[PDB]
mmCIF file with all atom_site columns, C-alpha atoms in Angstrom:
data_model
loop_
_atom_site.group_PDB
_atom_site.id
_atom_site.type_symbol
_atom_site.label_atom_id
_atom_site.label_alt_id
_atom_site.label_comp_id
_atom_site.label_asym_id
_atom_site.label_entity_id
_atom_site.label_seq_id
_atom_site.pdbx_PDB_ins_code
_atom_site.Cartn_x
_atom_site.Cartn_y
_atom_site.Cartn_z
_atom_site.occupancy
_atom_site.B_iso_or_equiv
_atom_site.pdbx_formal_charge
_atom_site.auth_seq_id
_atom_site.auth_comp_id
_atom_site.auth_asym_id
_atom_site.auth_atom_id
_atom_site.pdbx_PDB_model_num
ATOM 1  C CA . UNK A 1 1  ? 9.341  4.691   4.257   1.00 0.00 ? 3  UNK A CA 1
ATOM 2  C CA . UNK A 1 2  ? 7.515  7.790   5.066   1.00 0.00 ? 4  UNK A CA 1
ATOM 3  C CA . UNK A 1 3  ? 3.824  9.129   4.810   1.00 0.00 ? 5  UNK A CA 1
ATOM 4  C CA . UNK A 1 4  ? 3.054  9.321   1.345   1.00 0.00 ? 6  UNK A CA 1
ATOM 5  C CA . UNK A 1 5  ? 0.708  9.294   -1.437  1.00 0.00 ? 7  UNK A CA 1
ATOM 6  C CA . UNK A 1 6  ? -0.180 5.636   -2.434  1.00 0.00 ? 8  UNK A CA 1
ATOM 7  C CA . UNK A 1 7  ? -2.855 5.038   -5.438  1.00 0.00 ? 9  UNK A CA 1
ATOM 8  C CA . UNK A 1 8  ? -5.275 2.023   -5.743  1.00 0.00 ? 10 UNK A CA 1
ATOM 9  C CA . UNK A 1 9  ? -4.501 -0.173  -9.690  1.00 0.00 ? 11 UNK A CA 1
ATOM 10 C CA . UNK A 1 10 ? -7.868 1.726   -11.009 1.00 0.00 ? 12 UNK A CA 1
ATOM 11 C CA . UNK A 1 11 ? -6.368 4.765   -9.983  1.00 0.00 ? 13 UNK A CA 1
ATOM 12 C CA . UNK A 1 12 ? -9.781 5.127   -8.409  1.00 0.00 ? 14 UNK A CA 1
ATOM 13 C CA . UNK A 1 13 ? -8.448 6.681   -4.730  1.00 0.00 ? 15 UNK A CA 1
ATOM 14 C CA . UNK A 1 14 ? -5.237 7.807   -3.616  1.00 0.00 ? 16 UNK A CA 1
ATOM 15 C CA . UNK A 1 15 ? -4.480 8.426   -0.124  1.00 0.00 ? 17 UNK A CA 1
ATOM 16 C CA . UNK A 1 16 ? -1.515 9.969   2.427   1.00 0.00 ? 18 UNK A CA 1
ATOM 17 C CA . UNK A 1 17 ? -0.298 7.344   3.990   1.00 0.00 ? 19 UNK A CA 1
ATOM 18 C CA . UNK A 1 18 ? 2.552  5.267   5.975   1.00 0.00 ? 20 UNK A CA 1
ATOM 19 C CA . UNK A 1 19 ? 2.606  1.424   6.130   1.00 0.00 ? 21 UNK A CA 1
ATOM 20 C CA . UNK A 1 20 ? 2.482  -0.174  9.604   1.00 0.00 ? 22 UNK A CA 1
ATOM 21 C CA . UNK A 1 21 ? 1.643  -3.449  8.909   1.00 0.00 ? 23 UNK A CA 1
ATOM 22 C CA . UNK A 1 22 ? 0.416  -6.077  5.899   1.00 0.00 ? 24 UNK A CA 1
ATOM 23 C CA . UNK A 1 23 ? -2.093 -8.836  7.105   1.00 0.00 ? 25 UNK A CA 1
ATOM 24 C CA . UNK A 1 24 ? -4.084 -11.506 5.350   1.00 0.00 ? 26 UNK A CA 1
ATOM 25 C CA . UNK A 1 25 ? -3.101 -9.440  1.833   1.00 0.00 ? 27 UNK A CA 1
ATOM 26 C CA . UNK A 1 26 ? -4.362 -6.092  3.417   1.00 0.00 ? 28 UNK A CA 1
ATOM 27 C CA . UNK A 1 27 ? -2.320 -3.053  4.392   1.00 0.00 ? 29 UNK A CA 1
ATOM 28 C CA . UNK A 1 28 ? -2.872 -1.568  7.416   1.00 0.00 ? 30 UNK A CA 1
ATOM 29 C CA . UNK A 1 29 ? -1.959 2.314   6.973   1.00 0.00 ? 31 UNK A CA 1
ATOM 30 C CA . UNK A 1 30 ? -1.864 5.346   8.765   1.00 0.00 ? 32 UNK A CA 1
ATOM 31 C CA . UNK A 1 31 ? -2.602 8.463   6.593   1.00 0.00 ? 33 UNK A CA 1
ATOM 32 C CA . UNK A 1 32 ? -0.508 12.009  7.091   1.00 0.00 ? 34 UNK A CA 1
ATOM 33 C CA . UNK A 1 33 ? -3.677 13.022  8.033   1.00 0.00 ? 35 UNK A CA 1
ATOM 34 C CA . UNK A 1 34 ? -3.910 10.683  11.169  1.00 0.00 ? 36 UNK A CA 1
ATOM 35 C CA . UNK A 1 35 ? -6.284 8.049   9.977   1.00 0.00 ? 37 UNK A CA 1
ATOM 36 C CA . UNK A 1 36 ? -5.741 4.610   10.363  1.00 0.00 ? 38 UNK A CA 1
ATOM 37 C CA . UNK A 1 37 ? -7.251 2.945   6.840   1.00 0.00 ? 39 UNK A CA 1
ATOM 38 C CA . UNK A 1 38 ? -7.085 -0.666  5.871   1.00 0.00 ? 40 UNK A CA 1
ATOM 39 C CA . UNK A 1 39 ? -6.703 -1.141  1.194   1.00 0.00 ? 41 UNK A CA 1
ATOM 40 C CA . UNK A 1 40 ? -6.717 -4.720  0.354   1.00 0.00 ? 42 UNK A CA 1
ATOM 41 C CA . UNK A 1 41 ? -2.188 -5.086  -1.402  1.00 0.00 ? 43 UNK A CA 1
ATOM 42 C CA . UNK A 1 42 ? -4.171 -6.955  -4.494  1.00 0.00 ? 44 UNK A CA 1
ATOM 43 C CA . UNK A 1 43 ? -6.262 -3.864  -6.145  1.00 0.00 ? 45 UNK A CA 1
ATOM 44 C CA . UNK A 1 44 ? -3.618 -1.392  -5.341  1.00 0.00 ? 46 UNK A CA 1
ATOM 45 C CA . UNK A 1 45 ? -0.809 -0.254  -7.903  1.00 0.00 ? 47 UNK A CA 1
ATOM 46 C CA . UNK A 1 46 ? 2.263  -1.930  -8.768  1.00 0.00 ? 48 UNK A CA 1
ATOM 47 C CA . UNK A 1 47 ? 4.863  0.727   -7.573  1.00 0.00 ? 49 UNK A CA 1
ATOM 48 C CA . UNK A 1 48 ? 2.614  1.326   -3.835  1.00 0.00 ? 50 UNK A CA 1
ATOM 49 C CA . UNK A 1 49 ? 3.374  -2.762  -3.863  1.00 0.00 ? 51 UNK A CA 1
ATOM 50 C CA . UNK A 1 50 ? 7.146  -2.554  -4.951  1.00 0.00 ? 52 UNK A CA 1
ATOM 51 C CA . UNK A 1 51 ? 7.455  -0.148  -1.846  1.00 0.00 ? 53 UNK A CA 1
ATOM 52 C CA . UNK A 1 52 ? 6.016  -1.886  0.459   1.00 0.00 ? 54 UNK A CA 1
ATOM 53 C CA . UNK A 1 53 ? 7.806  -5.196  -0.523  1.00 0.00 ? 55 UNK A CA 1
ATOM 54 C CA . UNK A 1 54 ? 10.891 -3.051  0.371   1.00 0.00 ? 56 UNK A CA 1
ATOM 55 C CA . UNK A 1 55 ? 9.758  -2.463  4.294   1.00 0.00 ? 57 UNK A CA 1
ATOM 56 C CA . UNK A 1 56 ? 8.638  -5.615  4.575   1.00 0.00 ? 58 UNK A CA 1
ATOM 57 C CA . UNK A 1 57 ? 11.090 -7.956  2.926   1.00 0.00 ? 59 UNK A CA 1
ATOM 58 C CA . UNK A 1 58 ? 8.129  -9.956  1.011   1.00 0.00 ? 60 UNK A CA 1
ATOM 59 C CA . UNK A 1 59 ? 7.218  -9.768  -2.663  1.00 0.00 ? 61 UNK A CA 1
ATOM 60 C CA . UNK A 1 60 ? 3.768  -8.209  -3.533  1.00 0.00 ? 62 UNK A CA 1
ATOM 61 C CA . UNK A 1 61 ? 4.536  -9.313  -7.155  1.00 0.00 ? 63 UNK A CA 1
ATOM 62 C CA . UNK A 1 62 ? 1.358  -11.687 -7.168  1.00 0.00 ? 64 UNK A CA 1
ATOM 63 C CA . UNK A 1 63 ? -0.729 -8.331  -5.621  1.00 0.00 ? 65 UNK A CA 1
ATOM 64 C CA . UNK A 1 64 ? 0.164  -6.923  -9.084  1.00 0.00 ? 66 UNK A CA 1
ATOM 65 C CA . UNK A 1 65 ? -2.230 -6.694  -11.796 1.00 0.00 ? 67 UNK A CA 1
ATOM 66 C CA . UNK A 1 66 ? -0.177 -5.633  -14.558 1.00 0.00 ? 68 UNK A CA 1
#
């Protein structure tokens, strides 16, 4: 897990980024850049979901749309 470049399911944004903590099915991230953003696990893309299942132990399978 390292600062990186996560993208939404749309493929609408994609941000720099490091996972801190997931809450209510909302990441809590802190960009490369040093901003602290909050994108909702459910409208984000698969793989972004897959590697944050894997630092937090849970399974954001349901958060994926396809």
């Amino acid at each position: 897990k390292k600062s990186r470049l996560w993208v939404d399911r749309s493929g609408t944004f994609k941000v720099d980024a490091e996972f801190i903590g997931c809450a209510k099915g909302k990441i809590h991230l802190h960009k490369a850049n040093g901003v602290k953003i909050a994108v909702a696990a459910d409208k984000l893309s698969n793989e972004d979901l897959a590697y944050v299942e894997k630092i937090t132990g849970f399974s954001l399978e349901k958060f994926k749309a396809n």
